[PDB]
Amino acid sequence: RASANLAATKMSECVLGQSKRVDFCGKGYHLMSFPQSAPHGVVFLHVT
Amino acid sequence: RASANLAATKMSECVLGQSKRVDFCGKGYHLMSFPQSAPHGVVFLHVTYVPAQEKNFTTAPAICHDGKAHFPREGVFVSNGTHWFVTQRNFYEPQIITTDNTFVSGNCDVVIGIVNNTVYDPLQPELDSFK
Amino acid sequence: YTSALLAGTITSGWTFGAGPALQIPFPMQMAYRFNGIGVTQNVLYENQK
Amino acid sequence: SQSIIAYTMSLGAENSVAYSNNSIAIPTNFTISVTTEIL
Amino acid sequence: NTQEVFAQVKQIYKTPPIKDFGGFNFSQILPDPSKPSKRSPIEDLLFN
Ligand SMILES: *[C@@H]1O[C@H](CO)[C@@H](O)[C@H](O)[C@H]1NC(C)=O
Ligand SMILES: *[C@@H]1O[C@H](CO)[C@@H](O)[C@H](O)[C@H]1NC(C)=O
Ligand SMILES: *[C@@H]1O[C@H](CO)[C@@H](O)[C@H](O)[C@H]1NC(C)=O
């Protein structure tokens, strides 16, 4: 559940907008993100 | 305890200041917040900002005026069918395209899809009125 | 839901996440994202392909 | 005439937006909303 | 947890059939309509 809350925060900030927190959405200056479904999980592709 | 730490961070960010994290202080653009106390709990009221009444516009990224590409400073070029205007990104408000509203960068053959128009500075009519 | 999220991202920018979905051309969106990181947008329009 | 029904979930309303390479939607009005949240 | 990490939007969108994206090519994360599971091939590698 703790990891899922982290995932929901990442989906709400990295995908739906552009965060200025450094290294929250991967290494480098964050541009955007795309989500992909996975068995029991999610996979983010961060574009930086 | 995990919930309590989350609520503490919510108060320390959404209430004592303005946060830019989307959907951290409620759904929309966050403006401000108020707390209220409940038996063994806290209830926030987020005051947020949501736009409506959108319209259709034709756009262009840059303007080649005298062989030089003008780029808008803060906002976007729009065209309503006949003229061109600069506006900001979240409220429709047209203005005449000025030297104050754009800036010059490079040559207008590289950028894809530029649109020919005119750029009004106030300085040529200022000089020519005295002339 | 994943396909819906990708559709909203690639056609609307971040504006659908706070209200009604607005279309916007995609490299214009990329220009705004460079303006988010302190890079002036004319860097993009010279170097798109 | 009341009874119990079973159904496949509807996720939400389908909404297709007219994308182009040269079209922008700009809002004109705005509303201030207050939402509650309980922890 | 699954609902709060995924159910974040209240209209289901769709990309237009034309792909005039100025040169970007999202062919690997877009869904593929030639499969019974309308998934991107990245999702197919993840599931395999
Ligand atoms: C913009 O124009 C297109 C076609 O011209 C139309 O389908 C669409 O509904 C218009 N946008 C709005 C917000 O009405
Ligand atoms: C937008 O797409 C149309 C498709 O007919 C194309 O003719 C036009 O050149 C494109 N716009 C730009 C600025 O390239
Ligand atoms: C996108 O890339 C794939 C991988 O090579 C290619 O098969 C496809 O034709 C490309 N799509 C476009 C529109 O260029």
From Swiss-Prot, chain B:
Positions of glycan attachment: 56, 80, 116
Disulfide bonds: 14-25, 64-108
Outcome, altering residue 74 to K: In strain: Theta/P.3
Task of the protein: Subunit of the fusion protein that is processed upon entry into the host cell. Mediates fusion of the virion and cellular membranes by functioning as a class I viral fusion protein. Contains a viral fusion peptide that is unmasked after S2 cleavage. This cleavage can occur at the cell membrane by host TMPRSS2 or during endocytosis by host CSTL. In either case, this triggers an extensive and irreversible conformational change that leads to fusion of the viral envelope with the cellular cytoplasmic membrane, releasing viral genomic RNA into the host cell cytoplasm.
Name of the protein this chain belongs to: Spike protein S2'
Organism (species): Severe acute respiratory syndrome coronavirus 2
Gene behind this protein: S
Curated annotation (Swiss-Prot), chain D:
Glycosylation sites: 21, 29
Top-level division of the source organism's lineage: Viruses
Function according to Swiss-Prot or TrEMBL: Precursor of the fusion protein processed in the biosynthesis of the S protein and the formation of virus particle. Mediates fusion of the virion and cellular membranes by functioning as a class I viral fusion protein. Contains two viral fusion peptides that are unmasked after cleavage. The S2/S2' cleavage occurs during virus entry at the cell membrane by host TMPRSS2 or during endocytosis by host CSTL.
Name the record gives this protein: Spike protein S2
Name of the gene encoding the protein in the UniProt record: S
Residues shown, of full length: 689 to 727 of 1273
